[PDB]
Swiss-Prot record, chain C:
Portion held of the full protein: 287 to 1150 of 1726
Subcellular location: Nucleus
Self-association state and partner proteins as the record states: Interacts with RNA polymerase II and the DRB sensitivity-inducing factor complex (DSIF complex), which is composed of SUPT5H and SUPT4H1. Interacts with KDM6A. Interacts (via SH2 domain) with SETD1A. Interacts (via SH2 domain) with POLR2A phosphorylated at 'Ser-2'. Interacts with IWS1, AICDA and PAAF1. Interacts with histone H2B and H3. Interacts with WDR43. (Microbial infection) Interacts with human cytomegalovirus/HHV-5 protein UL69.
Tissue spec: Ubiquitously expressed.
Function comment: Histone H3-H4 chaperone that plays a key role in the regulation of transcription elongation and mRNA processing. Enhances the transcription elongation by RNA polymerase II (RNAPII) and is also required for the efficient activation of transcriptional elongation by the HIV-1 nuclear transcriptional activator, Tat. Besides chaperoning histones in transcription, acts to transport and splice mRNA by forming a complex with IWS1 and the C-terminal domain (CTD) of the RNAPII subunit RPB1 (POLR2A).
Positions where N6-acetyllysine occurs in the chain: K357
Annotated signal peptide: none
Stretches the record annotates as Interaction with KDM6A: 31-732
Name under which the protein is recorded: Transcription elongation factor SPT6
Family under the similarity heading: Belongs to the SPT6 family.
Organism: Homo sapiens (Human)
Length: 171, 126, 732
RNA sequence: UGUUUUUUUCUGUCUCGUGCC
């Protein structure tokens, strides 16, 4: 779930970047460093909206590299356990369902799915229906789910869904 | 221990600012509009494109004034910040569905008091 | 156990997976579905005619359902019931049509049941814009319309509501009929009311409330899908034009970049020409694609007049404006996007079909077994001298002299080559020593570049000048392209045959085997092994499952036409494992039969070896009677099955004019003299044989008479091609 | 209508005596 918080970071700037475009160069380096990455503390970062201020560059002793502890106002996406969101189904397989929560892909197994939703391997598009064939769930459909677990695979978040609670399907 | 169902989060995340699907959608759209201009600039990555096409399929309302109105009519209540995002994004039909999906609403408020809010949210949708 | 000890053959069970057999009533439906879906866009099976083709498909499906018939089993054994050699893709096409018909029938039954349940629920709820359960019957009956039926069912589900507890403009049916007929029979809501009055009776205070409902009704209507379906799919002049970035990125490599301003490409170029579809798909993947019919601007204008009022005096004008707005909303919802998606799906299907056809053609061209045996038929076969050199630049070139019985006799190396900058005698001496070491029957040299060709020519000249082909005569070294031997050298068979050998020896062995028995090599490979050889670049864009199925069907047909040697797959590893692509003898059944033969030590005594020893079931024996062959009864090693053995013996006796007394083995004149050469052909009449088969036998022998005569005259006939010598372009 | 080579920072112990700024 997306949020807007204030973060901090420092980047070393090589002395070749000194000049009238110092602040512009610092901003450009900041943009291509903290966009799209992920951390286990704050979660996955989408992008940066604006920068608060530029700190005082403390030149290191014996080294021309100077660090700028910049504080930027960026957004972050850190889903937690128990949250309910609305995602889209990407692929339907007998092992389980595949979805895509923005910068995440979760996964629901057949055990989580109730017994009413059977398999349709005979039909060309992998789909799940009921006995009466009234409700149909397939790919490219806005299907909800519940985040019952979380995981970070070395700055690569991958949660797990569930389909036990009622009112989880077509709106 | 981290479970949003029981309204618990780390200290850093407790002081965060909630965002709605339409809000993040328009923020990313404006960022794309700014970045596409000013040639000789590093183009967007696949993360930006996937987030855009993910948030564009759940934009209940395009007008920014709709976002302002729906946040203003909701902040007047005594619900926490976490209850401002999920309830305004999912837009459930009846109060029973909202209470079932979010266990925090069970016993926190009356039935008609939440049904009227859900009806207002549904009407605010474009 | 179910695959090997099953009542029905493996091929029959595998073909009719979705539809487990065909019933008497379902056979006609399956045949009709196959005929309707046989060739819609391109011309296929137009050979068999419309009604004749439909009858043949129905007969083949009925035979497959009853006797567990298969593709080759029904194509050859049922030549009368199906197209009599109309095309190679006869049994496989019939099986695919039957499976499609069964799947369509099952889907229609499910849709009808769902519609009936929904109608019952609506009657229970509202019976205690209405909700009527009348479209369920139409959906159930609409078996041919798969996509249209699914769209209609989804629209009905979304309109009625789909909930399972446990007056605005023209009507949808009238609008659909007016659009389909091209004349607006029904106008909009011809009433004095306008959108101002209709937007107050929901609670929105906006005039667009009814437009959304009208658009939802129009999009979720089977009639609209049927009217729009095939309007642009039938003809769509896709204009190929690279974009700003596509022009430089494609570099004229894809369909959307080859023609800078080459537009107006109709459905023929994409469907019939699979290369164009593959190029469009590849270009449309990353950079961009130019796929636009550009014919709507005039197809969408005619619909605008229909469903709208003609007068304009407030009530009439308001009704016309509301109808136009509703039509525009419906078109924006599921009018342009639906047509574009249908066109894209049709283009993808055409590209996949073209790729599959190209793969099948390549498999047919490269799979025909055309070895180069002695005299183009001392000892059985010829000694293939597989010479697979690495460089011919002072490096050891593999040269194996394998025999004609699917085995390698010996080999040797030739490190000396023309290494030495100026040495024109060391290579000649090495070649002479290698030729004198053994007595090969033919030379199979490979090639990689000009140097390899020069080395091969020098070796051939040295062999011919000094009579090094056999040590007593000149042997012509037949050129062999390094295409199959290189792949077969590093295969499972190559590794098993020789483990502590260099790759040159394996390549030489593979080249020798490929020029002695291509069928043995094809049957003794995983089919993995077949997928290694690329049939065409367009096959990659299309699904590889269709290409694999086509290759498997072609291999099975070739094996059935050429037959399988029972004794060849008993002790010789080279000619073993050839019971996987038989008509009715699946891979599991073939493996079980091979294991039983290896354990019990049973040989190919006759055609009834698997029926008498209890190794194969009656259905398996009947379906695989025309593919199993033995070394020795007289008609065992041929296409004559046990059912036609008596007829074949009687025909041979009549042709030879010999005595008739229990002719199975004892009288050898009509059998041996007839097999040696044609004794008498005018004695056996087609009409008399057909009458005898009809009176006694329960089947006409008009088409099977020629096959029986050929089997009696020639046993173990090979369906492979002849030895194809490399050409100039082919050699290069 | 041809032309033979590619591997690299090692490393040593504890004790005593003598001479020099």
């Amino acid at each position: 779930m997306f949020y807007h918080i204030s973060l901090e970071h420092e980047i070393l700037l090589h002395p070749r970047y000194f000049g009238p475009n110092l602040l512009n160069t610092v901003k450009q380096k900041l943009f291509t460093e903290v966009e799209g990455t992920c951390t286990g503390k704050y979660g996955f970062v989408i992008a940066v909206t604006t920068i608060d201020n530029i700190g005082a560059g403390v030149i290191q002793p014996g080294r021309g590299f100077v660090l700028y502890p910049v504080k930027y106002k960026a957004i972050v996406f850190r889903p937690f356990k128990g949250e309910v969101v609305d995602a889209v189904v990407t692929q339907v397989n007998k092992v389980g369902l595949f979805t895509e929560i923005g910068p995440m892909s979760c996964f629901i197994s057949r055990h989580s799915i109730p017994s009413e939703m059977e398999f349709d391997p005979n039909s060309n598009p992998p789909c799940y229906k009921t006995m009466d064939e009234d409700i149909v769930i397939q790919q490219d459909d806005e299907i909800r789910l519940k985040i019952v677990g979380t995981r970070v695979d070395k700055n690569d978040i991958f949660a797990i869904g569930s389909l036990m609670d009622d009112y989880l399907g077509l709106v | 221990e981290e479970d949003a169902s029981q309204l618990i989060f780390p200290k850093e995340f407790e002081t965060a600012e909630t965002l709605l699907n339409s809000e993040v959608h328009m923020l990313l759209e404006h960022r794309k509009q700014q970045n596409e201009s000013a040639e000789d600039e590093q183009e967007l990555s696949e993360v930006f494109m996937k987030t855009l096409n993910y948030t564009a399929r759940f934009s209940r309302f395009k007008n920014r004034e709709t976002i302002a109105s729906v946040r203003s009519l909701l902040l007047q209540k005594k619900l926490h910040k976490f209850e401002l995002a999920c309830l305004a994004n999912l837009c459930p039909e009846t109060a029973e569905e909202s209470k079932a999906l979010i266990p925090s609403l069970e016993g926190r408020f009356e039935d008609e008091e939440l049904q009227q809010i859900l009806d207002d949210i549904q009407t605010k949708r474009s | 156990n179910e695959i090997r000890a099953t009542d029905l053959p493996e091929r029959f069970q595998l073909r009719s997976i979705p539809v487990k057999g065909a019933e008497d009533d379902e056979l006609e439906e399956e045949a009709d579905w196959i005929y309707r879906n046989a060739f819609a866009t391109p011309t296929i099976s137009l050979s068999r005619k419309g009604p004749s083709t439909i009858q043949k498909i129905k007969e083949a499906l009925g035979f497959m359902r009853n006797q567990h018939f298969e593709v080759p089993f029904i194509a050859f054994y049922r030549k009368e019931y199906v197209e009599p050699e109309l095309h190679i893709n006869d049994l496989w096409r019939v099986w695919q049509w039957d499976e499609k018909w069964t799947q369509l029938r099952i889907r229609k039954e499910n849709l009808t049941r769902l519609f009936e349940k929904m109608q019952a629920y609506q009657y229970e709820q509202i019976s205690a814009i209405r909700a009527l359960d009348t479209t369920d019957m139409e959906r159930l009956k609409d078996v041919q319309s798969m996509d249209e039926l699914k769209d209609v069912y989804n629209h009905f589900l979304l309109y009625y509501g789909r909930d399972i507890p446990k007056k605005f403009g023209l009507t949808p049916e009238q609008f659909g009929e007016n659009l389909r007929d091209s004349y607006q029979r029904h106008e909009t809501e011809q009433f004095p009311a306008e959108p101002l009055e209709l937007a107050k009776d929901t609670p929105e205070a906006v005039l667009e409330g009814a437009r959304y409902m009208v658009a939802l009704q129009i999009a979720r209507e089977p009639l609209v899908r049927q009217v729009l379906r095939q309007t642009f799919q039938e003809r769509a002049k896709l204009n190929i034009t690279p974009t700003k970035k596509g022009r430089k990125d494609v570099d004229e490599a894809h369909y959307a970049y080859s023609f800078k301003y080459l537009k107006n490409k109709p459905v023929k170029e994409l469907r019939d020409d699979q290369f164009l579809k593959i190029c469009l798909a590849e270009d449309e993947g990353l950079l961009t694609t130019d796929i636009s019919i550009d014919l709507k601007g005039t197809y969408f204008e005619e619909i605008k007049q229909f469903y709208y009022r003609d007068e304009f005096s407030h009530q009439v004008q308001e009704w016309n404006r509301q109808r136009t707005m509703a039509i525009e909303r419906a078109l924006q919802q599921f009018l342009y996007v639906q047509m574009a998606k249908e066109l894209k799906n049709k283009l993808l299907a055409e590209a996949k079909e073209y790729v599959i056809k190209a793969c099948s053609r390549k498999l047919y061209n490269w799979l025909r077994v055309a070895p180069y045996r002695p005299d183009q038929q001392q000892g059985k076969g010829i000694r293939v001298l597989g010479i697979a050199f690495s460089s011919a630049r002072d490096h050891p070139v593999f040269c194996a002299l394998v025999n004609g019985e699917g085995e390698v006799t010996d080999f040797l190396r030739l490190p000396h080559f023309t290494e030495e900058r100026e040495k024109k005698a060391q290579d000649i001496e090495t070649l002479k020593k290698f030729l004198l070491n053994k007595k090969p029957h033919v030379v199979t040299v490979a090639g990689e570049n000009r140097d390899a060709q020069m080395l091969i020519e020098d070796v051939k000249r040295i062999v011919h000048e000094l009579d090094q082909g056999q040590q007593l005569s000149s042997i012509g070294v037949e050129l062999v392209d390094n295409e199959l031997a290189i792949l077969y050298m590093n295969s499972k068979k190559s590794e098993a045959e020789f483990r502590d050998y260099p790759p040159v020896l394996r390549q030489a062995v593979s080249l020798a085997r490929r020029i002695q028995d291509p069928l043995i090599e094809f049957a003794q490979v995983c089919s993995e092994d077949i997928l290694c050889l690329k049939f065409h670049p367009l096959q990659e864009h299309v699904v590889k499952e269709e290409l694999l199925n086509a290759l498997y069907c072609e291999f099975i047909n070739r094996v059935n036409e050429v037959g399988v040697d029972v004794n060849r797959a008993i002790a010789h590893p080279y000619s073993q494992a050839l019971i996987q692509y038989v008509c009715g003898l699946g891979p599991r059944k073939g493996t079980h039969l091979l294991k039983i033969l290896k354990q019990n030590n049973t040989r190919l005594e006759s055609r009834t070896q698997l029926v008498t020893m209890c190794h194969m079931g009656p259905k398996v024996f009947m379906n695989c009677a025309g593919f199993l062959k033995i070394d020795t009864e007289v008609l065992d090693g041929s296409r004559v099955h046990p059912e036609t053995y008596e007829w074949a013996r009687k025909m041979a006796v009549d042709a030879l004019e010999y005595d008739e007394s229990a002719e199975d083995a004892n009288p050898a004149g009509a059998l041996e003299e007839i097999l040696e050469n044609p004794e008498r052909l005018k004695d056996l009449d087609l009409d008399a044989f057909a009458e005898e088969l009809e009176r006694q036998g329960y089947g006409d022998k008009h088409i099977t008479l020629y096959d029986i005569r050929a089997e009696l005259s020639c046993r173990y006939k090979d369906l492979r091609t002849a030895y194809r010598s490399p050409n100039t372009e082919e050699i290069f």
